[PDB]
Structure formats: C-alpha cells, structure tokens
Design a protein around this ligand. Structure first.
Ligand SMILES: OC[C@@H]1[C@@H](O)[C@H](O)[C@@H](O)c2[nH]cc[n+]21
Length: 440
C-alpha cells in the first residue's frame, strides 16, 4: 500500500490543437500549428490537426469518460486564436462559449479545471509580427491572459501560463522541428527571454483580476545521468539540467538571472540588456508544474554534449524508461528552489496499442510505466516534496505534433476512422488508483 495525502489531485491532461480539430470553426483565426502542419514535409505522413479526436464536437462524451473514470482533475488548454482571432483586439464570443461549456460541465461533475493558457498554438496573425521573437508579445500575452481571467476566473482557479517554454523557444526556433519552424539561435534565446517576460506580465494581471486563484508554469524535464566518472561528463550533466530542465526559467524567477552554465553557452545570444527585465520576471508564482517522461545518458563531446544509447526498455518514441527520474527531479526542484507547491503536470508513455479480438487494449506496458512512476512520486512525498497533484498524459490518443497520429499516449484509445473511444487497461487501472488514492 502506497497511499497519497488527503485531497491529492489525480488528473489527466490534453492540449487544444492535439485533440480538438475544427481549427477554423466558429470564427477561429489560424494558429501557427495549422500553417506549420499544412506545410509539406513538416509532419509525419502529412498529418494535421484538422480533425484530430474531434473533441470540438465530442467534448461532452470525453468529459463523461473522465467522470466515469473518477478522475478528479482535468488539465486542458485554450486555443489563443479561438479567443482572439488576430491575437489581440477582437474577442470571439463563440470561442469563449466552447470553453465555458467545458468548464461548467467539469464543475457540475465535480472535476477540477487546470487551464493551460498557452500550449503552443500561437495565433498566426502574431507570428506574422514576429511571434515569440517580438518583445511586444509580453503585452499581447497579457491582454490574452486578462481576457481569460475576466471570463473564466470566477470558476477556474488553477492556471498555467506556459507549457514547456524551452520547447517553444528551442524546438520551434532553433531546431525548426515545431512551429513556427525556424533555425536561428539568436531568435531562439530572444524567445526564451520573451516567454519569461510574457509569463511574468500574465501573473501580474492575474493578481489584479482573480483575487482567489493560483497560477503557475510548466516545464519539461529529463533525468540526465553522466556516461562516466569524468569531471567533463558530470559537468555535461550540469549543463543539460540547467538548460533543458526547469532551472533555465526558475533561476530567473526565483534568483533573478539565468543559470551560470546557460550564460557560458548562450550570453552572446540573449539581448544585451536582458538583466533590465529580471526584476519584473521575478513575479511571485504559486506552483511549479513539472513534466517528466524519460532519462538520458550524457557525455561531453567536442552544444558540447551528445547522448549515449543505453540498452534499457524504451517506449515507442524511443525514450528510455527511467522511473527513478521522476523522484530525482522532484527532490531536485525542492532542493534548488523550494517552490511552495509542485504538480506533475504530465507523465505518460507511447506504446504500439492494438485492439485485441477482445476488443480491449491490453497495454500492460503502459500500466507498468505508470505504476513505476506513481511509486517514485509517492517516495518524494514521503521525503517532504510538496507534490499536490499528478496528471497522466493523456486522456486520449491524439495528434503528437511532428509525429502526427502515429504515436499513441492515451489511456483511452481513439479509432480515428470512427472516432470511437475504447478505454485501455491502463485507464481502468488508473481509475482504481484514483478511487483508492494510491497504489496497492
Ligand atoms: O510527447 C508527449 C507530449 C506532448 O503530446 C505534449 O503536448 C507535451 O506537453 C509533452 N511534453 C513532453 C512530452 N509531451
């Protein structure tokens, strides 16, 4: 028996562009994921978010699935361009109505809404004006956030400004693998910095608008272990943590500067007077959300870092399964920054799910993955990490960004030819976990 604290939030998580479809319904503006995925060569099999899980029409059934499973919290995101089609100025009432109906239904059913304000679908109109590269995004984001607060802050009390700003900046603007598909290191670090200033401006508006809520920010994290005992391999791991994990953003937020190994690699790429923005960036936040999935063996390599293949079980993504990582990153966040609250805002796995003659989905692979990680998060709670909740990625199989529909992360199976949902063995298993408030 590994029982969790009283009132611990068991959740599932999604994102707007990944599940909704109908990206241009009811007056919505185009997002950068619409235009990116409609550009040939950008996404596996030419997949797009045009239909996805059709959650835009099937939202009530999906929520009834959450209810039926006894899951207590739902993390979902809001499509910025459904709300403000040109990014700023005009507010689309039908976009608001979409999420209002979802919010009210959740509350009526006793499910707690966790709203991610930004999960990667920037209005195309703002990308034309530079997107995250443009300092003015701090204002655009603040105005968008304000609209959300004033419309939903009466019911939604748990808010996340940004999902994984490292991904948004680096993967979108350095690697060119995600929208807007750019490859410029100077742009990428100007996006890092602007994402911090936009987050902080949104927290500032939140304090003025929603006197009773809590607001945080979510980061992607990996468990980096060194390839050897050498100083250089250990330092490589020190860099990877500071750059890829929560320190890139939490050091500015809590300590007022970037981490030192980030400045050694990247100072030339940041704005010259970037320090002028640091005091505003230190705006107080209520919680840290950490996403965690995999570990990496790492060595210095004359980036100056490469990864080392390890045997280890991998998921269908080719990601090594390292459950002790989730315990480590939870310990390390307390040790380094001691935020008053942490949530695991995403944890999950992609496996090659098949519907058996059954037709059940016997994803014992995913049960083992989840169980293992839930166990390590228990451990962290026993050693005093203020972990208040845990969210499975994902409720549904969905559009997995540049992988398209070929990667299935759901605890609910989606048959794309019909839109039939089939609860996986992992979903039933997780329901039992929530009911008992822990493992057995
Ligand atoms: O790759 C599975 C998922 C994506 O679908 C989510 O949008 C994203 O927030 C995330 N971070 C780490 C892994 N994932």
């Amino acid at each position: 028996v590994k029982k969790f604290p009283e009132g611990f939030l068991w959740g599932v998580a999604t994102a707007s562009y990944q599940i909704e479809g109908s990206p241009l319904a009811d007056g919505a503006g185009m997002s950068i994921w619409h235009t990116f995925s409609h550009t040939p060569g950008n996404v596996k099999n030419g997949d797009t978010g045009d239909v996805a899980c059709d959650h835009y029409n099937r939202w009530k059934e999906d929520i009834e699935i959450i209810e039926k499973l006894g899951v207590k919290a739902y993390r979902f995101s809001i499509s910025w361009p459904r709300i403000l089609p040109e990014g700023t100025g005009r507010v689309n009432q039908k976009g608001l109505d979409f999420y209002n109906r979802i919010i009210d239904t959740l509350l009526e059913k006793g499910i707690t809404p966790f709203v991610t304000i930004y999960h990667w679908d920037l209005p195309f109109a703002l990308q034309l004006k530079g997107g995250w590269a443009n300092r003015e995004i701090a204002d655009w984001f603040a105005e968008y956030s304000r609209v959300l607060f004033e419309n939903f802050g009466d019911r939604v009390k748990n808010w996340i400004t940004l999902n994984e700003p490292w991904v948004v900046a680096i993967v979108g603007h350095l690697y060119g693998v995600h929208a807007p598909g750019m490859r410029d290191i100077y742009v990428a670090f100007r996006a890092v910095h602007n994402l911090l200033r936009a987050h902080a401006r949104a927290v500032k508006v939140f304090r003025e608008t929603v006197k009773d809520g809590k607001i945080g920010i979510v980061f992607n994290n990996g468990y980096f272990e060194p390839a050897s005992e050498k100083e250089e391999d250990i330092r490589a791991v020190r860099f990877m943590h500071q750059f890829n994990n929560y320190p890139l953003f939490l050091n500015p937020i809590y300590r007022g500067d970037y981490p030192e190994l980030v400045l050694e690699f990247a100072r030339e790429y940041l704005p010259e007077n970037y320090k002028d923005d640091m005091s505003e960036i230190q705006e107080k936040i209520d919680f840290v959300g950490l996403n965690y999935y995999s570990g990496h063996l790492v060595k210095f390599d004359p980036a100056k870092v490469s990864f080392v293949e390890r045997d280890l079980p991998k998921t269908a993504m080719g990601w090594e399964i390292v459950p002790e990582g989730i315990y480590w990153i939870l310990k390390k966040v307390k040790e380094e920054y001691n935020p008053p609250e942490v949530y695991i805002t995403e944890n999950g796995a992609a496996f090659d799910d098949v519907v058996s003659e059954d037709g059940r989905v016997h994803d014992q692979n995913r049960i083992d993955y989840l169980k293992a990680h839930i166990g390590q998060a228990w451990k962290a709670i026993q050693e005093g990490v203020p972990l208040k909740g845990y969210f499975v990625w994902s409720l549904l199989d969905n559009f997995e960004w540049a992988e398209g529909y070929s990667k299935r992360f759901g605890i609910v199976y989606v048959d794309y030819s019909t839109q039939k949902r089939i609860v996986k063995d992992s979903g039933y298993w997780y329901s039992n976990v929530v009911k008992n408030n822990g493992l057995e």
